């Protein structure tokens, strides 16, 4: 709400992400993050994916998160659109579902008819593709290794967690989820890949208030990853686990 | 042009202003600055005006800088509008001219007819007045002393310099001014109180490119003040004086 306030908040975020050290200087991680034109949590998870051996997947995920409407859901074809979407649904959640969508598009030869059949916006995937190429070019310039996790997608989940631990939520016994940061009651959106399999712990990309305070893009986590990637930030009960 | 880049730049600014120490922690100055909803250079000069004994004037100046069109200049009354404006012109420049305008408005009983006579936008002064009251309320909450410099307006110039040293410019022998920060050729606007008395050294509020790269709101400085208020930032030849 004021230049100084938001600057201080952003500085604190950088420290917790590992971008700044105890003396407030940029770390190697911070320097690398700074080369990308993304918001800091996205930069963090991209760099970490290099260390976690899943930068091939993360480049795609980051690009998919940077575009708007990937799926469309016509009023008269809702069950069909949901059926086609659910085929992409991954058990680990929304980020890996976005990866699945992009990879399928690629494997089906970047086909507009295929996008139409599956209720996917071809224009959004094309923009995602452009962004990915840009991000890959930055990776290559600064010798940041691009590798795939293959079937070991737990490494993708961990990388997301290393960036978005601040957005951790634990399932509430009575209703929805409670955020760890300030105990806000939040919910998994009906469109989420996790809506019918709501796990104990998640991180979310962002919060959006519509019908309820909804989490947008949720990924399943192990609570121990919070301590692994943000050991100063969490207490084995700051915020309890 | 990217979240990380602009954040790093803003952090560097805070350090040079004295808002952050060598370990990147908020100083007493930084903590005080953070209570105001202004851009950091404005916050700096407001806090410093407390130490320099001119916070009465600075509250007014900061409020006047926070509003849009104070003077108006009708096409058919240009010489008259300029004549009425020049009556407010202070030898030290634009910031002290803004102070003179507000104080005269007050001394003439906040009169709309008076504003009309002098080609001043009454609505802009009213908004400036509202902002001043808000800023004064923040000063009072945190026990930041409000005092006047009286006739010793050099203290106002020094306070401006302590905040805006980054925007220092030295007069170029051949044409206009050269900024100290990156040697950009810049000019005093025809509307400035300093246009017909262009001094050796100035600081400016901002740069605006119109007909030329124009400095907007210039105040005369002594180059020694740059060393006084930013001793690590300037060389007695970083940037030469
Ligand atoms: Br690193
Ligand atoms: Br983000
Ligand atoms: Br888009
Ligand atoms: Br102070
Ligand atoms: Br400013
Ligand atoms: Br205004």
UniProtKB/Swiss-Prot annotation, chains A, B:
Tissue-level expression reads: Expressed in skin, cervix and nerve. Also expressed in the brain.
Source domain of life: Eukaryota
Record's subcellular location: Nucleus
Q: What family classification does the UniProt entry report for this protein?
A: Belongs to the DEAD box helicase family. DEAH subfamily. DDX8/PRP22 sub-subfamily.
What is this protein for, i.e. what is its function?
Answer: Involved in pre-mRNA splicing as component of the spliceosome. Facilitates nuclear export of spliced mRNA by releasing the RNA from the spliceosome.
- Fill in the domain comment: The RS domain confers a nuclear localization signal, and appears to facilitate the interaction with the spliceosome.
How is the quaternary structure described? Identified in the spliceosome C complex. Interacts with ARRB2; the interaction is detected in the nucleus upon OR1D2 stimulation. Interacts with SRRM2. Interacts with CACTIN.
Q: What is the name of the protein in this document?
A: ATP-dependent RNA helicase DHX8
According to its UniProt entry, this protein's organism is: Homo sapiens (Human)
- Gene responsible for this protein: DHX8
Could you say which residues of the full protein are shown? 950 to 1183 of 1220
């Amino acid at each position: 709400g004021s230049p100084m306030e938001t600057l201080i908040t952003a500085m604190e975020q950088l420290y917790t992400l590992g971008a700044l050290d105890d003396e407030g200087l940029l770390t190697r991680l911070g320097r690398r993050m700074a080369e990308f034109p993304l918001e800091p949590m996205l930069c963090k998870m991209l760099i970490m994916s290099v260390h976690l051996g899943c930068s091939e997947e993360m480049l795609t995920i980051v690009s998919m998160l940077s575009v708007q409407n990937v799926f469309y859901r016509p009023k008269d074809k809702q069950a069909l659109a949901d059926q086609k979407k659910a085929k992409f649904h991954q058990t680990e959640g929304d980020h890996l579902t976005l990866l699945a969508v992009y990879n399928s598009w690629k494997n089906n030869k970047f086909s507009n008819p295929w996008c139409y059949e599956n209720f996917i916006q071809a224009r959004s995937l094309r923009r995602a593709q452009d962004i990915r190429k840009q991000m890959l070019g930055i990776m290559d310039r600064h010798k940041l290794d691009v590798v795939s996790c293959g079937k070991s997608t737990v490494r993708v989940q961990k990388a997301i967690c290393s960036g978005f631990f601040r957005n951790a939520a634990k399932k509430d016994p009575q209703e929805g989820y409670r955020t760890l940061i300030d105990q806000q009651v939040v919910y998994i959106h009906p469109s989420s890949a996790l809506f019918n399999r709501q796990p104990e712990w998640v991180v979310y990309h962002e919060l959006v208030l519509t019908t309820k305070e909804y989490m947008r893009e949720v990924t399943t986590i192990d609570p121990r990853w919070l301590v692994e990637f943000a050991p100063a930030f969490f207490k084995v009960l700051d915020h309890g686990l």
